Amino acid sequence: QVQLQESGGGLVSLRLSCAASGFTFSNYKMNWVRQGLEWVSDISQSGASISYTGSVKGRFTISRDNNTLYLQMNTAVYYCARCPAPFTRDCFDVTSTTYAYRGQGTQVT
Amino acid sequence: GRIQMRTRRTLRGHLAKIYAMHWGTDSRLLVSASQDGKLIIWDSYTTNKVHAIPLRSSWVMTCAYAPSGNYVACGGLDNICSIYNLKVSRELAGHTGYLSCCRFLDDNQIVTSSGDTTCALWDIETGQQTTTFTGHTGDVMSLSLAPDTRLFVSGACDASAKLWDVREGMCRQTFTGHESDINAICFFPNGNAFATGSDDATCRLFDLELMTYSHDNIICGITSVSFSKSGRLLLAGYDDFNCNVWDALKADRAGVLAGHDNRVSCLGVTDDGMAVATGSWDSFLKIWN
Amino acid sequence: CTIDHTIHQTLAPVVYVTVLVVGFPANCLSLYFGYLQIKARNELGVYLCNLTVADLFYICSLPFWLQYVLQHDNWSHGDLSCQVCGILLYENIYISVGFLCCISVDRYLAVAHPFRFHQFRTLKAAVGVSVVIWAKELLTSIYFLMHEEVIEDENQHRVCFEHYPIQAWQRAINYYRFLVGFLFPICLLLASYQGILRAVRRSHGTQKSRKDQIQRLVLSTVVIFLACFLPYHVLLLVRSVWEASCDFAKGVFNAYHFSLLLTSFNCVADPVLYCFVSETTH
Amino acid sequence: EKAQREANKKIEKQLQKDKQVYRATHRLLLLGADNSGKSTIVKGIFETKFQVDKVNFHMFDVGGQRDERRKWIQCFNDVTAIIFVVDSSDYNRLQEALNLFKSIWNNRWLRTISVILFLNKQDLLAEKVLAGKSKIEDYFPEFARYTTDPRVTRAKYFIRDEFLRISTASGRHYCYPHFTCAVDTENARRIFNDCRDIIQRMHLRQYELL
Ligand SMILES: CC(C)CCC[C@@H](C)[C@H]1CC[C@H]2[C@@H]3CC=C4C[C@@H](OC(=O)CCC(=O)O)CC[C@]4(C)[C@H]3CC[C@]12C
């Protein structure tokens, strides 16, 4: 049973921490989504090749820890999303509706 | 133990990738579907092409030879489970997603699935959804019918496989052992157990997760799963350019099936278990042993 | 008319030994890869299989000529061997030439016109043109062979497939030989490969390095063909035209047989050039 | 058995007929967002039958499915090219276009299929950047340092350069960028020429000319 938890939320910097279990965290890459349901940023398998959404490059910062993903607030729900590909860097349906491999969200303002 | 087998007859003649194929009750006759839009019915033993019918839609994601053999179902990307008559008959409509798979319960009814999470059961002579199955959250990719047509399971992209009953129409239990898309499903010939191919480069067996297969060198997922006549072996096609043979009971690799110029698409097994045909994206249907 | 044929003993044996030990395994490898191309629905595979079997047939005659030159240019076997070895060593060259033209024309029709010429780029057409070439080969072979005067005897040494001075019929048919087997195939190869290079340089979806390697390969194959055949056919033409006496024949002897040795190098040039450079085998 | 033999012979008769008609036809895949007017480019499946220079093209539009598109996309690997259509006007979904193209580029099966990139709303992009209501640098700070009406051309080449960088970051399949609108009727010629180039490269690979 794949299942994800997150910690954080509340009035505003904040520690958006993702609690993941049930699958190999190292194999799959990660993504951030805000709600639109638009993608934010990703971290490759080795913690490099980081790319950002333009309205996120300056204000926000991400990091990866080996079963947890960290984002730091410098305004909506933040699901913690990952990609279905285990050993390749294609990723299609993170933005999709009713996508299973996504977080439950923390409300930040 | 260790099993090896080689190509016996190459059913060349297709123009595009053989994406799905199916056998009848008589293993001599097989139906091969390709994206070129041409359902060729091949005589296995004599390499003869007994029937060669054309198709309304080029894309064909599944083909169902009825056990009675009278009709053939051509489910493709089009939202229609076209049924052709031998010795076009109906145009089933109502699905909102691509026809991932189709299976004949008997002569007059068909059970199908869509790209949408909904799975449906039709009646051919009226074209009406007698039962509806809408418990999934991801795209349903494949079906699997037990020797008894009462139960069927529908592997979905949400890493969940839900077992359905045709009459009640409601799911009773769900499996979520996998961690990625499940694009291959096939009941074990005995009992309620069934295998699940997944894109996570791991195959797992489920029953009322209890088994898994994965090596470090394997970085590609599964594409098709089927068992033998007795189910001891587990032939699972792979994304890499060659098929792989697994053991249902043992975690080690029984052997390899190389010889395909592209990925395996569908790994059909004859009902009597006297042959195995692995339709590949090389437009060839090699029959092994 | 006695000819000092020391050039054979001094130069030919090493050329023949190298040609055998290089081409023969290379020819088998090229046949294997051509059959692999046959496995796919590729028409070029038929042409390479045909070319390499022709080159293997050319190899077959070489040990007899090696034993001949090592015997101080004296034929000893039965006249059947003389006839068949003459036919091979002096005609299979042209089968290979036409086969190269088939390869080049197939490549041109595929690359330059990827949408139109589909019926001709079919295995049926490849088999048809192959049968046509082999029928022409049989016609020329039965034309040459029926001439019982093919084998000569001078100074207790039997010279096979060579008359000093040239015979009337042999001289007359060397014009047809040179013309039909050089003039038209060379222009066909040039006209096909110029079009291929035009198509490659007009290609928009390929990087510059790969275009550079393609043009290098095309220049390599054209240079191989020209530098391997030009001297032999030019000297054959002058042998048929200018030569009218034994002294001229024995004077040209050395360059004639050196050019023939280059034509022997042809069949070790073909396999690597048409199969080994390609990245498919890698 | 002679009846079976003659029936079979007839079968490969119409099968070679079908083989030559099939090789006479080229398949295509049309992709894009809902706001992207791919139907204008055209002008279960929204089938299209169009031909140019006596070769038949079949451009297949998949509009009958849902958002999840990572599975039925695998059925289109045999196509000569993918007509990718981007509505770059709404920069909010332009990042979606980048992510979708990146997924296509790095997909296991699509690394062999060249993609035709069509920027579909260049008039709309020009009008939007002229208005300046939403700043491009806000949606992408890289435009505050990128260097080549000059501004509309700069924005258009920046948005195409994003996709081109994504493509070139990983030979084999190529990406052809193009600018199109609703009024352009020459999209068929662009598709035909790019498919011709793709088939030429496939022949180079096939005929051992590389
Ligand atoms: C008297 C003897 C010594 C003359 C020897 C020359 C012939 C062996 C060769 C040299 C050039 C060849 C000709 C050049 C080219 C062609 C085209 C070629 O046709 C193709 O390649 C079709 C390929 C395709 O479209 O699939 C083969 C026939 C032909 C007439 C060949 C026929 C046999 C020829 C005359």
Side-chain angles (χ1 to χ4, degrees):
Chain A
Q1 170 58 47
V2 65
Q3 188 274 331
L4 282 85
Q5 294 297 109
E6 293 83 3
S7 72
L11 188 65
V12 67
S13 299
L14 192 147
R15 317 287 104 183
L16 307 98
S17 168
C18 302
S21 66
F23 69 99
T24 309
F25 182 76
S26 190
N27 299 342
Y28 312 85
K29 71 188 284 192
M30 284 73 74
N31 301 269
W32 275 107
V33 297
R34 68 180 65 252
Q35 311 193 15
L37 193 59
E38 170 41 59
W39 175 92
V40 176
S41 186
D42 68 13
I43 297 172
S44 74
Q45 294 312 333
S46 74
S49 179
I50 314 302
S51 188
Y52 273 47
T53 300
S55 307
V56 176
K57 187 170 192 184
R59 297 189 74 184
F60 293 99
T61 305
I62 56 181
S63 70
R64 186 273 303 278
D65 187 13
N66 290 318
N67 281 92
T68 43
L69 193 79
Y70 292 66
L71 166 79
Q72 281 81 38
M73 162 58 233
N74 189 179
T75 183
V77 181
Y78 280 58
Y79 291 177
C80 202
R82 63 100 167 172
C83 295
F87 288 132
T88 186
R89 74 281 191 191
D90 61 354
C91 183
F92 263 101
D93 291 331
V94 166
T95 187
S96 82
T97 300
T98 61
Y99 182 76
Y101 318 137
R102 209 148 66 183
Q104 292 300 320
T106 62
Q107 288 69 240
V108 310
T109 50
Chain B
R2 188 270 299 164
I3 295 94
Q4 63 84 30
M5 65 182 179
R6 54 215 208 278
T7 302
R8 303 292 181 185
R9 307 167 193 91
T10 297
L11 291 192
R12 67 188 66 251
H14 268 281
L15 277 296
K17 46 179 179 305
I18 298 196
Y19 184 77
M21 61 79 71
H22 198 67
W23 303 84
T25 54
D26 291 331
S27 70
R28 187 178 186 176
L29 277 299
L30 62 83
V31 163
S32 174
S34 49
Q35 311 282 119
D36 60 349
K38 194 70 172 65
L39 264 186
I40 299 103
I41 296 89
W42 309 71
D43 193 310
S44 171
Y45 277 120
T46 67
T47 314
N48 167 27
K49 310 162 177 57
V50 191
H51 293 130
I53 62 170
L55 299 172
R56 281 285 314 282
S57 61
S58 62
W59 320 107
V60 184
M61 297 204 206
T62 187
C63 60
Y65 193 68
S68 172
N70 301 14
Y71 292 165
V72 290
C74 182
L77 196 150
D78 62 326
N79 295 320
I80 296 92
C81 181
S82 310
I83 292 173
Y84 296 83
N85 63 6
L86 277 297
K87 62 96 176 175
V88 182
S89 75
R90 204 77 182 195
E91 294 293 328
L92 317 178
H95 266 302
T96 44
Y98 68 83
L99 265 296
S100 66
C101 186
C102 298
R103 291 283 185 266
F104 274 105
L105 306 188
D106 68 70
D107 192 34
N108 64 27
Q109 55 178 0
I110 193 68
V111 56
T112 76
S113 69
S114 52
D116 177 275
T117 73
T118 303
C119 305
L121 161 60
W122 313 73
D123 184 24
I124 296 169
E125 64 273 12
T126 190
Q128 295 298 109
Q129 318 213 354
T130 62
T131 318
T132 311
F133 302 99
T134 176
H136 274 292
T137 53
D139 299 5
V140 176
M141 294 299 291
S142 55
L143 280 67
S144 188
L145 277 296
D148 62 274
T149 48
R150 311 287 292 168
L151 303 193
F152 84 98
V153 65
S154 53
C157 296
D158 46 30
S160 80
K162 294 181 176 67
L163 183 63
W164 305 94
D165 191 357
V166 289
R167 294 298 181 94
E168 281 77 0
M170 61 79 71
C171 174
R172 294 179 293 173
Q173 60 84 29
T174 306
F175 291 161
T176 44
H178 271 285
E179 46 184 66
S180 198
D181 294 331
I182 297 160
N183 47 13
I185 295 284
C186 181
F187 267 78
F188 182 76
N190 300 113
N192 305 289
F194 68 94
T196 77
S198 183
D199 287 35
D200 51 22
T202 289
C203 176
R204 295 161 205 235
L205 199 152
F206 292 89
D207 199 9
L208 62 95
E209 178 179 355
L210 60 86
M211 185 64 72
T212 177
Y213 319 113
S214 54
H215 295 105
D216 289 9
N217 46 24
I218 291 183
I219 68 164
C220 52
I222 322 293
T223 186
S224 158
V225 161
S226 66
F227 289 83
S228 77
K229 47 166 188 289
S230 303
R232 168 59 201 279
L233 214 53
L234 188 153
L235 283 72
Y238 265 84
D239 299 290
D240 62 357
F241 269 35
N242 51 355
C243 172
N244 184 8
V245 184
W246 284 98
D247 291 331
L249 312 173
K250 280 73 176 175
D252 63 340
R253 273 169 87 161
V256 65
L257 278 164
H260 282 294
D261 203 6
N262 214 324
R263 63 173 286 177
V264 176
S265 76
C266 182
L267 200 157
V269 169
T270 71
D271 301 11
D272 48 356
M274 293 177 70
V276 166
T278 70
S280 174
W281 286 14
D282 45 40
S283 82
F284 297 124
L285 180 59
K286 294 186 175 61
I287 314 191
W288 314 74
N289 189 359
Chain C
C1 180
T2 293
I3 297 89
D4 186 74
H5 37 68
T6 315
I7 207 73
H8 280 290
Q9 293 84 49
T10 52
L11 188 67
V14 55
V15 161
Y16 290 146
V17 159
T18 61
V19 162
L20 267 70
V21 305
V22 166
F24 182 76
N27 275 205
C28 311
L29 264 291
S30 291
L31 182 63
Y32 155 83
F33 282 108
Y35 167 76
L36 264 290
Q37 291 308 310
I38 301 299
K39 284 172 67 177
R41 272 302 215 202
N42 199 310
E43 285 74 18
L44 180 141
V46 182
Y47 296 141
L48 281 71
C49 294
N50 267 286
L51 163 68
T52 185
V53 65
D55 276 337
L56 282 165
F57 269 40
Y58 182 76
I59 301 299
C60 294
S61 81
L62 278 179
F64 311 100
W65 277 85
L66 177 66
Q67 191 265 330
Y68 157 78
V69 292
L70 263 65
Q71 190 178 2
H72 311 310
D73 310 289
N74 178 10
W75 215 267
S76 55
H77 284 302
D79 189 36
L80 180 63
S81 290
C82 166
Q83 298 140 2
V84 65
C85 293
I87 300 299
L88 294 174
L89 189 150
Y90 289 81
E91 295 294 327
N92 199 3
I93 279 164
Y94 291 115
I95 301 309
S96 300
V97 174
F99 272 24
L100 299 186
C101 311
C102 295
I103 297 169
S104 65
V105 168
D106 189 358
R107 282 179 176 174
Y108 170 78
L109 282 184
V111 170
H113 312 325
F115 287 148
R116 281 82 65 193
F117 292 85
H118 283 244
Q119 47 168 356
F120 297 153
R121 291 198 288 108
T122 46
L123 281 74
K124 302 211 299 173
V127 173
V129 299
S130 170
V131 175
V132 159
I133 305 286
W134 287 104
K136 178 268 159 195
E137 190 276 331
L138 294 174
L139 294 174
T140 307
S141 170
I142 64 170
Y143 181 76
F144 271 89
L145 185 144
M146 187 66 204
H147 276 234
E148 62 273 56
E149 313 196 15
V150 67
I151 180 163
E152 193 47 8
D153 201 330
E154 164 53 38
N155 195 65
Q156 316 315 306
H157 301 322
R158 289 209 160 210
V159 184
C160 180
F161 212 80
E162 266 303 275
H163 304 86
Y164 320 101
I166 198 74
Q167 281 282 354
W169 61 277
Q170 177 78 303
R171 181 218 312 116
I173 62 170
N174 290 318
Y175 302 102
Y176 293 126
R177 185 146 62 173
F178 152 75
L179 188 153
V180 184
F182 190 65
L183 271 181
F184 184 68
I186 185 56
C187 65
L188 275 187
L189 294 174
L190 296 170
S192 53
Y193 277 127
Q194 62 98 33
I196 297 169
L197 288 194
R198 295 179 66 250
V200 175
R201 70 187 66 259
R202 293 181 184 271
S203 181
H204 187 273
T206 184
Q207 60 272 58
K208 182 63 69 177
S209 303
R210 297 293 299 274
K211 302 165 80 153
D212 295 332
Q213 91 184 189
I214 297 169
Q215 60 88 27
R216 265 201 292 106
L217 172 52
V218 167
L219 299 195
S220 177
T221 186
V222 173
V223 160
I224 284 290
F225 181 88
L226 277 296
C228 191
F229 277 31
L230 183 63
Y232 170 53
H233 283 92
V234 173
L235 188 153
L236 183 63
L237 184 82
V238 73
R239 179 66 178 86
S240 312
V241 176
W242 205 340
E243 187 273 335
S245 58
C246 168
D247 63 358
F248 194 94
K250 60 190 300 185
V252 65
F253 197 89
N254 303 307
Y256 183 34
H257 293 285
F258 183 47
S259 51
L260 272 172
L261 294 174
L262 298 176
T263 69
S264 66
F265 276 145
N266 176 5
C267 66
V268 302
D270 308 300
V272 65
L273 183 63
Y274 274 111
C275 174
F276 294 176
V277 291
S278 161
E279 293 82 3
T280 295
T281 72
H282 311 158
Chain D
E1 196 271 333
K2 299 289 94 176
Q4 283 77 11
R5 178 70 275 172
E6 65 183 1
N8 196 3
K9 168 180 63 184
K10 257 84 165 186
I11 288 284
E12 292 84 4
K13 279 170 162 55
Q14 292 83 18
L15 259 65
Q16 63 84 30
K17 297 175 178 68
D18 291 331
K19 167 166 211 87
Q20 63 84 30
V21 304
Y22 175 82
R23 270 180 59 198
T25 61
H26 302 278
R27 295 131 287 284
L28 297 163
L29 171 62
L30 182 48
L31 264 174
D34 291 331
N35 49 335
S36 66
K38 44 187 180 160
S39 50
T40 61
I41 281 150
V42 175
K43 201 69 67 177
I45 295 95
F46 293 99
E47 182 86 24
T48 306
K49 277 74 69 177
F50 76 109
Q51 91 177 12
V52 163
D53 305 343
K54 287 183 302 315
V55 65
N56 295 350
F57 283 107
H58 284 147
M59 178 164 61
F60 302 88
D61 189 358
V62 183
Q65 307 303 316
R66 70 190 204 119
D67 265 11
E68 306 286 329
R69 73 156 69 77
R70 76 189 173 274
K71 304 312 294 296
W72 64 260
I73 193 66
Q74 293 179 356
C75 292
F76 293 84
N77 85 321
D78 63 358
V79 311
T80 77
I82 294 171
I83 316 301
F84 200 86
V85 185
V86 159
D87 169 27
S88 174
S89 297
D90 53 329
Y91 311 140
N92 294 288
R93 304 190 66 77
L94 183 63
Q95 177 52 238
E96 181 65 26
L98 294 174
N99 295 314
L100 183 63
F101 175 30
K102 185 177 173 74
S103 314
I104 278 182
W105 205 247
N106 302 281
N107 196 315
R108 168 60 186 88
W109 318 116
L110 278 298
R111 289 183 292 113
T112 61
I113 297 89
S114 302
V115 57
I116 323 298
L117 183 63
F118 272 105
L119 277 296
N120 202 15
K121 298 307 189 89
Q122 309 316 98
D123 180 77
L124 264 61
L125 277 296
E127 294 293 328
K128 182 171 206 163
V129 300
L130 275 154
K133 192 148 288 191
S134 76
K135 300 294 187 291
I136 303 99
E137 61 86 20
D138 197 18
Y139 288 106
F140 289 110
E142 300 93 329
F143 194 39
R145 66 201 69 256
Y146 182 76
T147 61
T148 300
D149 168 85
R151 270 195 293 99
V152 300
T153 300
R154 278 180 46 76
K156 146 165 54 180
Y157 279 73
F158 182 76
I159 62 170
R160 78 183 279 275
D161 196 6
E162 290 291 328
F163 294 85
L164 287 180
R165 178 199 319 117
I166 297 169
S167 73
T168 56
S170 168
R172 281 82 65 193
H173 72 315
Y174 195 54
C175 170
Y176 309 87
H178 287 300
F179 321 121
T180 187
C181 181
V183 308
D184 295 331
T185 187
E186 61 86 20
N187 293 315
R189 301 314 305 268
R190 280 183 196 279
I191 298 165
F192 154 80
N193 284 347
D194 267 337
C195 295
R196 194 168 175 279
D197 170 339
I198 291 153
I199 294 301
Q200 283 206 352
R201 289 168 74 261
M202 293 177 70
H203 287 171
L204 270 55
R205 193 147 291 106
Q206 185 192 118
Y207 281 63
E208 299 157 4
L209 269 164
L210 276 159

Short mmCIF file of all heavy atoms in Angstrom, two decimals, chain B residues 43-60:
data_model
loop_
_atom_site.label_atom_id
_atom_site.label_comp_id
_atom_site.label_asym_id
_atom_site.label_seq_id
_atom_site.Cartn_x
_atom_site.Cartn_y
_atom_site.Cartn_z
N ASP B 43 -3.50 -19.63 -39.38
CA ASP B 43 -3.45 -21.05 -39.03
C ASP B 43 -2.07 -21.33 -38.46
O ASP B 43 -1.06 -21.21 -39.17
CB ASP B 43 -3.75 -21.91 -40.25
CG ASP B 43 -4.02 -23.36 -39.89
OD1 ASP B 43 -3.22 -23.96 -39.15
OD2 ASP B 43 -5.05 -23.91 -40.36
N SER B 44 -2.01 -21.70 -37.18
CA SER B 44 -0.73 -21.83 -36.50
C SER B 44 0.13 -22.93 -37.12
O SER B 44 1.30 -22.70 -37.46
CB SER B 44 -0.95 -22.11 -35.02
OG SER B 44 0.26 -22.44 -34.37
N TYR B 45 -0.44 -24.12 -37.29
CA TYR B 45 0.36 -25.27 -37.69
C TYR B 45 0.86 -25.15 -39.13
O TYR B 45 2.03 -25.44 -39.41
CB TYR B 45 -0.44 -26.56 -37.51
CG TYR B 45 -0.42 -27.08 -36.09
CD1 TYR B 45 -1.59 -27.23 -35.36
CD2 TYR B 45 0.78 -27.43 -35.48
CE1 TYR B 45 -1.57 -27.71 -34.07
CE2 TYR B 45 0.81 -27.91 -34.19
CZ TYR B 45 -0.37 -28.05 -33.49
OH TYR B 45 -0.34 -28.53 -32.20
N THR B 46 0.00 -24.72 -40.05
CA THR B 46 0.35 -24.67 -41.46
C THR B 46 0.77 -23.28 -41.93
O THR B 46 1.00 -23.10 -43.13
CB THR B 46 -0.83 -25.15 -42.31
OG1 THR B 46 -1.91 -24.22 -42.20
CG2 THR B 46 -1.31 -26.52 -41.83
N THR B 47 0.86 -22.30 -41.02
CA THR B 47 1.27 -20.94 -41.34
C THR B 47 0.28 -20.30 -42.31
O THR B 47 0.51 -19.20 -42.82
CB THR B 47 2.70 -20.93 -41.89
OG1 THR B 47 3.53 -21.76 -41.06
CG2 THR B 47 3.29 -19.52 -41.87
N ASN B 48 -0.83 -20.98 -42.56
CA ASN B 48 -1.85 -20.45 -43.45
C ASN B 48 -2.58 -19.29 -42.78
O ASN B 48 -2.73 -19.25 -41.56
CB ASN B 48 -2.84 -21.56 -43.83
CG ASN B 48 -4.11 -21.04 -44.49
OD1 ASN B 48 -4.11 -19.98 -45.12
ND2 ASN B 48 -5.19 -21.80 -44.36
N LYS B 49 -3.02 -18.33 -43.60
CA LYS B 49 -3.83 -17.21 -43.12
C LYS B 49 -5.27 -17.49 -43.53
O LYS B 49 -5.71 -17.13 -44.62
CB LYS B 49 -3.33 -15.89 -43.68
CG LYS B 49 -1.84 -15.67 -43.53
CD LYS B 49 -1.36 -14.59 -44.48
CE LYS B 49 0.11 -14.28 -44.30
NZ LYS B 49 0.95 -15.50 -44.47
N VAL B 50 -6.01 -18.15 -42.64
CA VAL B 50 -7.36 -18.61 -42.97
C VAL B 50 -8.27 -17.42 -43.29
O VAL B 50 -9.00 -17.43 -44.28
CB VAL B 50 -7.94 -19.47 -41.83
CG1 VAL B 50 -9.21 -20.16 -42.29
CG2 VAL B 50 -6.91 -20.48 -41.38
N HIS B 51 -8.23 -16.40 -42.45
CA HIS B 51 -9.03 -15.20 -42.67
C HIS B 51 -8.15 -13.97 -42.53
O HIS B 51 -7.23 -13.94 -41.71
CB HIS B 51 -10.20 -15.12 -41.68
CG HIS B 51 -11.24 -16.17 -41.88
ND1 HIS B 51 -11.71 -16.96 -40.85
CD2 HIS B 51 -11.91 -16.57 -42.99
CE1 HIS B 51 -12.62 -17.80 -41.32
NE2 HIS B 51 -12.76 -17.59 -42.61
N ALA B 52 -8.43 -12.96 -43.34
CA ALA B 52 -7.72 -11.69 -43.30
C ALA B 52 -8.77 -10.60 -43.51
O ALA B 52 -9.10 -10.25 -44.65
CB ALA B 52 -6.61 -11.63 -44.34
N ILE B 53 -9.28 -10.06 -42.41
CA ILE B 53 -10.34 -9.06 -42.46
C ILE B 53 -9.74 -7.69 -42.22
O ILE B 53 -8.73 -7.57 -41.52
CB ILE B 53 -11.45 -9.38 -41.44
CG1 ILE B 53 -10.88 -9.35 -40.02
CG2 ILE B 53 -12.07 -10.74 -41.73
CD1 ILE B 53 -11.93 -9.43 -38.95
N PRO B 54 -10.32 -6.62 -42.77
CA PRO B 54 -9.83 -5.28 -42.45
C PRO B 54 -10.54 -4.65 -41.25
O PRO B 54 -11.43 -5.25 -40.65
CB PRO B 54 -10.09 -4.54 -43.76
CG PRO B 54 -11.35 -5.34 -44.38
CD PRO B 54 -11.66 -6.41 -43.34
N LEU B 55 -10.12 -3.45 -40.87
CA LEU B 55 -10.58 -2.84 -39.64
C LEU B 55 -10.97 -1.39 -39.87
O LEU B 55 -10.33 -0.68 -40.65
CB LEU B 55 -9.51 -2.93 -38.55
CG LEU B 55 -9.13 -4.37 -38.19
CD1 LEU B 55 -7.95 -4.42 -37.25
CD2 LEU B 55 -10.33 -5.10 -37.60
N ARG B 56 -12.03 -0.96 -39.19
CA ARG B 56 -12.49 0.42 -39.31
C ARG B 56 -11.46 1.39 -38.76
O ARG B 56 -11.22 2.45 -39.36
CB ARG B 56 -13.83 0.58 -38.58
CG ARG B 56 -15.03 0.08 -39.36
CD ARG B 56 -15.40 1.04 -40.48
NE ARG B 56 -15.42 2.43 -40.02
CZ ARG B 56 -16.41 2.97 -39.31
NH1 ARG B 56 -17.48 2.27 -38.96
NH2 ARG B 56 -16.32 4.24 -38.95
N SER B 57 -10.83 1.06 -37.64
CA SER B 57 -9.85 1.91 -36.99
C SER B 57 -8.48 1.25 -37.05
O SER B 57 -8.35 0.06 -36.75
CB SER B 57 -10.24 2.18 -35.53
OG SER B 57 -10.30 0.98 -34.79
N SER B 58 -7.47 2.03 -37.45
CA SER B 58 -6.13 1.48 -37.57
C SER B 58 -5.58 1.02 -36.22
O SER B 58 -5.03 -0.08 -36.10
CB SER B 58 -5.19 2.51 -38.20
OG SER B 58 -5.08 3.66 -37.39
N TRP B 59 -5.73 1.85 -35.19
CA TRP B 59 -5.21 1.51 -33.88
C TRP B 59 -6.07 0.45 -33.22
O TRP B 59 -7.28 0.63 -33.05
CB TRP B 59 -5.12 2.76 -33.00
CG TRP B 59 -4.66 3.94 -33.75
CD1 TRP B 59 -5.40 5.01 -34.14
CD2 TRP B 59 -3.33 4.18 -34.24
NE1 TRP B 59 -4.62 5.90 -34.83
CE2 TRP B 59 -3.35 5.41 -34.90
CE3 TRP B 59 -2.14 3.46 -34.17
CZ2 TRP B 59 -2.21 5.95 -35.50
CZ3 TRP B 59 -1.01 3.99 -34.76
CH2 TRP B 59 -1.05 5.23 -35.42
N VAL B 60 -5.44 -0.66 -32.84
CA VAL B 60 -6.11 -1.79 -32.23
C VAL B 60 -5.33 -2.18 -30.99
O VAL B 60 -4.26 -2.80 -31.10
CB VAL B 60 -6.23 -2.98 -33.19
CG1 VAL B 60 -7.01 -4.10 -32.54
CG2 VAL B 60 -6.87 -2.55 -34.49
#
